[PDB]
Design a binder for this molecule. Structure first.
Ligand SMILES: CC(C)(COP(=O)(O)OP(=O)(O)OC[C@H]1O[C@@H](n2cnc3c(N)ncnc32)[C@H](O)[C@@H]1OP(=O)(O)O)[C@@H](O)C(=O)NCCC(=O)NCCS
Ligand SMILES: CC(C)(COP(=O)(O)OP(=O)(O)OC[C@H]1O[C@@H](n2cnc3c(N)ncnc32)[C@H](O)[C@@H]1OP(=O)(O)O)[C@@H](O)C(=O)NCCC(=O)NCCS
Ligand SMILES: CC(C)(COP(=O)(O)OP(=O)(O)OC[C@H]1O[C@@H](n2cnc3c(N)ncnc32)[C@H](O)[C@@H]1OP(=O)(O)O)[C@@H](O)C(=O)NCCC(=O)NCCS
Ligand SMILES: CC(=O)N[C@H]1[C@@H](OP(=O)(O)OP(=O)(O)OC[C@H]2O[C@@H](n3ccc(=O)[nH]c3=O)[C@H](O)[C@@H]2O)O[C@H](CO)[C@@H](O)[C@@H]1O
Ligand SMILES: CC(=O)N[C@H]1[C@@H](OP(=O)(O)OP(=O)(O)OC[C@H]2O[C@@H](n3ccc(=O)[nH]c3=O)[C@H](O)[C@@H]2O)O[C@H](CO)[C@@H](O)[C@@H]1O
Ligand SMILES: CC(=O)N[C@H]1[C@@H](OP(=O)(O)OP(=O)(O)OC[C@H]2O[C@@H](n3ccc(=O)[nH]c3=O)[C@H](O)[C@@H]2O)O[C@H](CO)[C@@H](O)[C@@H]1O
Ligand SMILES: [Co+2]
Ligand SMILES: [Co+2]
Lengths: 449, 449, 449
């Protein structure tokens, strides 16, 4: 079938105390409204009409989906009024699903359910029964049939007793929506245009409204302040964790895990406490990730062991690598099979070959390191003259003594050995020993301050 | 009006298994009893009478408030007896509020409520209804009026059914308190002096006792062991977190945040998981604090980005700074606008000028660094001859090569450049290149062990 | 009395999505089944019969207890059938307790209770009443007496209403067990051998079955997937935490603490958030452990202060030491009294004497350091020529300048002083100043790229 989605995101989010549009505040690493658009496109929406009021600049900057149609609502005179603005783009032959930009957790499964329930020529409405229905539009039925919605401000003490409430999500046909929308007036408590009136209009036209319910309450919870955003973030993380656990991923504490992106994985992956996964992360089989690690946009091969407090960004680790604790891999770091990176080591745009080790207090940037190479503690590749960055190349079987600086550009041939404390400014030959050392001397009977 | 507070802190805290007075064990970074004194002074108490038994030495050492009057209770013969000791200092014309030193969460709002309820010449009593009232003094009323309190040991099976219990907090007039206190005897189950008897004495004198209730149960919960202290700590942290969230501060996980001091803040501040705030911390607008950071007594300007696992103490960061991950700023560290501090870098009593960068494996202590300065990786300021510490000064536009030691005291002029691996013992001129390098040589066909 | 235990561990654990036997997946640092064996031996079991199906190789590899008797169950035809295999080794004069290898939390106290309840010649059965008894064997009683168990598949709608269910744990005499086991047939819903039938057989023999209940539900919860394992891990950690709190150990957040081994401790020990304890750890009096520390198999003396994010393995710290933040102690690290280790410092097979300090960016391996020694920042002991490792010895009162490398083997005598930036290849005399420095020179008017 055909269907388009309209997302209302023109409301003011003052209880957030922010200089950023409310629907842009993130949850799980992404804008609240991006979550809604994702569900919209995942549902098959043909067009996605974003109705906004202000901060349109900040909005277009952050939102760049293709099926995105921007609709301005200069004045917020109500949800019905906001829909009136988008109406012009509705297709008589297409279904129109309405959503809120501040209700991020709504699921596609529930939206698919609502979809299939919409009566022909009728309306699909999503409702939930709440313990305390205060503030919500009340659902009135006659002989068991939905005949309308009474906003909290307008309901009578008696109607206020109804616990079935309107969540705000509904689907109808473009043409229908258009005829009803045109007949809206604002004679009411709030003195605005209620999109909720269309339920009545449709009913007295003979049409029928069907009400389906969500799988969970959080599915239709809206965000008006940062406490509510916080709450939903935990709900989301708890769901993510459950899925992973049931999928074979062991989490040492599901309450202390955060997934802010996408995780692909093999079998027997084990993740300890307080680990954060961001962007796109791929883990091979039997990968072990110690406590406190932050992994972002990286590939980690089979049998890798990431020790506690290790930060990895845009890195690529081949099989059987061991890194950490306290290691920092920056964009471009690559570790071939069996490579080892110890504590207080930083890598950026550098490849460490098979079986090579960089054990301690080392900085490797803009470097190409061969296999079975040993980088002594304190080694640093000085890759920047203050204007340009230069490359350092270290061949296979090289042994770099502790506290060596390699002033780029420089190449060290296979099997070379670099004396501890050497400042390397010139290429080193294969099988040669490079050194720039002052012989050690002594001064007898020396007294300090 | 006039009012004084009496804090009972002379009881034994044996279930703590500690060599430190029970009321000194901290909650949220401060002694349990300091919490009570804070509420007392915040309520306007004129005098605060601390009734203690032992560890008076450790107590005076830790408690140094001005309105503090120490009252010794050599023997713990009961709460009534403890009040008898403080009685001599009560003012006939002042109200006397009684509190417990091991009930830290009592709120000022609830204490203010009790204050305004106290009948003229009567007593203000705080009561709570509990599911299991075992162990607590039972509140007896007649025709709906509080006529006394029956301690658990003395109540009858029937009175033990009463669920309204005495929390221990009450307020009365100095003179009244004095006449009643003098009439206390210890004929009872426990064989001690119950301050709770004054309720009866006042009633048969014709006076009236009013009972107000707390806002929350935790408000009047007492601490007898470390599990209970733990519980209250989480309650306290949860309240703190809520306030911040509602005030515009985004916390990625309110359950993984700890505030042990005071936090001032601007708008759009974002705090990730497991961050600890201690002492007095001020955050400008849009400050981002990554996971695992510990921030103590520091000032952080607008737009600063603190990366994961960064420890900051008594530091001052100007606007737009970026520090971490794995950075350690010690007392005296100062970063001017746009300064950058990378991983595995430590600063102590050192100022890093505008746009200056200290990227990796570096230690800067007792240093003054100008603007647009670049401190190569591995650089260390050797600020201590073993007896005294000395200052290092680096002018603007200086470029310090990797692995350079600056033996203090030394000054590097503007625009100078220091060769990688240099040991700087003498001042460097402006626009000069300093170096102390051995030319690199090679030994052909070298074989390692 | 005499008693042997049989542990069924031959079932398939497919919902784990693992290549490792289900009962080998760990909880609190140890294999699920090791937990059961521990309780078995702690209960006094004489023999422990492990009934397994596959992965026997991986099982024997990981399990090496002495009283362990391996019984193969090539085909899993039911629990009764599995017991039939172990039957041959039962002693007519001994009690036989049956347990599950995937029910790790069962307690010895509850097992001791079941023990003492077993009627003479009867059966001790453990039962729990569940809200939703679906899937569990149903307990049928007549006139209040247990007369059998009806498996869920076989119960009638009416029997399915019974909420008292069989947990699977039972104890009986060897001889009895043997006669009943021999009379089992598999005419039933599942078409297998139910060990649960023996309850009926015993009843019609005139014997009596007694049902005792566990202290907590988690005690008899089984693990079929990683979500359930996760759940139990938290239950276990929560219990551990409670015990410690009640024993005098202060935990800043009992929900953020993990004990995966054994902890011995003194008084007033304080542990902050996110600390992990592994293997055997001993803490003296008043030890303070900051947030994020990982302590494994170490000894920590009185008054030690471990700062945030410090990793300690197989270390030994004397009294009053201070280490961290960001410190890494590896196997063999030893700190004598009052020693200090700062940030970004790593130690391995090295002893730091009384009052000695290694403040920053330092690596000490295979070293012996005397008392009152000061290791300047950037110091590194180059303990490996690429084939062998060598020892570095530093006498008392030595002062090592920043960025010094000590090429092992080398000895520095008492009171010596090593100039900053020195490469030490030869022994240094007592009270001598060692140096290998190029005098600093300057090049006027130097311009960078
Ligand atoms: C000192 C340094 C700046 C010189 O760079 P360079 O210009 O490429 O080296 P050059 O071969 O051109 O010679 C430089 C000058 O120093 C002098 N020089 C070289 N080696 C010397 C030594 N051992 N002793 C004294 N003077 C020496 C030369 O005479 C030469 O100038 P000249 O034209 O008068 O002969 C450079 O080697 C260095 O240490 N750079 C820093 C790299 C770094 O740490 N980067 C970190 C990136 S994050
Ligand atoms: C080596 C060191 C101790 C000398 O300090 P100093 O006394 O201030 O330096 P001085 O100029 O007084 O001269 C010291 C002696 O060494 C000798 N010397 C200096 N430079 C030398 C060189 N390149 N080669 C050989 N000998 C040298 C001098 O002859 C002099 O003694 P003299 O009186 O016999 O001539 C010092 O430079 C050093 O490295 N200090 C450590 C700083 C540090 O790392 N602090 C960390 C704080 S946490
Ligand atoms: C350079 C190094 C490899 C030499 O080791 P060594 O063989 O034990 O030292 P030796 O005394 O045997 O002499 C080595 C050679 O270098 C030459 N040499 C020594 N000092 C020199 C100097 N200052 N300048 C030039 N050449 C020098 C010698 O002539 C000698 O060879 P020769 O037989 O031709 O005379 C060594 O000192 C070193 O730096 N090792 C690395 C240690 C390390 O960092 N380990 C980390 C473990 S994780
Ligand atoms: C009249 C109406 O529709 N009532 C419904 C609306 O209440 P109500 O009108 O009170 O809801 P809100 O004011 O929060 O607005 C709903 C959503 O519409 C957006 N918005 C609102 C006004 C506007 O002019 N433009 C705009 O884009 C808001 O940004 C928000 O995303 O949602 C409730 C659920 O939350 C339902 O139970 C109510 O029946
Ligand atoms: C007789 C009396 O007052 N009973 C009240 C008291 O019980 P109860 O007397 O049982 O309470 P506690 O023994 O815990 O003592 C209360 C507080 O008084 C202090 N203290 C106690 C005795 C002493 O000689 N000196 C001293 O300073 C303790 O340190 C504690 O801070 O508190 C309960 C609430 O917790 C009330 O429900 C009881 O009605
Ligand atoms: C017939 C029987 O005994 N029923 C009991 C069994 O159910 P049920 O037979 O359904 O239980 P499971 O299939 O999970 O097996 C129980 C335990 O026995 C092991 N196993 C099973 C079959 C086999 O051939 N070999 C083997 O070693 C499993 O690995 C598991 O550790 O446990 C339930 C509690 O969990 C009880 O309420 C049921 O009354
Ligand atoms: Co060096
Ligand atoms: Co160095």
């Amino acid at each position: 079938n055909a269907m388009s989605v309209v997302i209302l995101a023109a409301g003011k989010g003052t209880r957030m105390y922010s200089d950023l549009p409310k629907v842009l505040h993130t949850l799980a690493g992404k804008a609240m409204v991006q979550h809604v658009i994702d569900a919209a496109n995942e549902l098959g929406a043909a067009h996605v009409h974003l109705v906004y009021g202000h901060g349109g600049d900040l909005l277009k900057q952050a939102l760049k989906d293709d099926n995105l149609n921007w609709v301005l609502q200069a004045e917020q005179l109500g949800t019905g009024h906001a829909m009136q603005q988008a109406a012009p783009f509705f297709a008589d032959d297409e279904d129109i699903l309405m959503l809120y930009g501040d209700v991020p957790l709504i699921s596609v499964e529930t939206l698919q359910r609502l979809r299939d329930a919409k009566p022909q020529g009728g309306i699909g409405l999503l409702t939930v029964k709440l313990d305390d229905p205060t503030g919500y539009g009340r659902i009135t039925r006659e002989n068991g049939k939905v005949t309308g919605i009474v906003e909290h401000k307008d309901a009578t003490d008696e109607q206020r007793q109804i616990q079935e409430i309107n969540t705000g999500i509904l689907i109808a046909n473009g043409a229908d929506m258009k005829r009803w929308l045109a007949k809206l007036t604002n004679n009411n408590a709030q003195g605005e245009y209620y999109i909720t009136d269309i339920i009545a209009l449709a009913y007295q036209e003979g049409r029928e409204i069907v009400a389906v319910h969500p799988q969970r309450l959080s599915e239709v919870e809206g965000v008006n302040n940062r406490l509510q955003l916080s709450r939903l973030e935990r709900v989301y993380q708890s769901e993510q964790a459950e899925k992973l656990l049931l999928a074979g991923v062991m989490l040492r504490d599901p309450a202390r895990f955060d997934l802010r992106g996408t995780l692909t994985h093999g079998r027997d992956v084990e993740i300890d406490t307080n680990v954060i996964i961001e962007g796109n992360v791929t883990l091979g089989h039997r990968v072990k990730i110690g406590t406190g690690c932050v992994i972002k946009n990286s590939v980690i091969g089979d049998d890798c062991e990431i020790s506690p407090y290790t930060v990895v960004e845009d890195a690529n680790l081949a099989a059987a690598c061991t890194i950490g604790p306290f290691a920092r891999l920056r964009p471009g770091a690559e570790l071939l099979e069996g490579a080892h990176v110890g504590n207080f080591v930083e890598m950026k745009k550098a490849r460490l070959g098979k079986g090579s080790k960089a054990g301690h207090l080392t900085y490797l940037g803009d470097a190409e390191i061969g296999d079975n190479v040993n980088i002594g503690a304190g080694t640093i590749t000085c890759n920047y003259d203050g204007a340009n960055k230069f490359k350092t190349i270290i061949g296979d079987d090289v042994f770099v003594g502790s506290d060596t600086q390699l002033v780029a550009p420089v190449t060290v041939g296979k099997g070379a050995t670099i004396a501890a404390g050497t400042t390397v400014t010139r290429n080193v030959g294969e099988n040669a020993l490079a050194i720039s050392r002052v012989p050690q001397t002594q001064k007898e009977g020396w007294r300090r301050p």
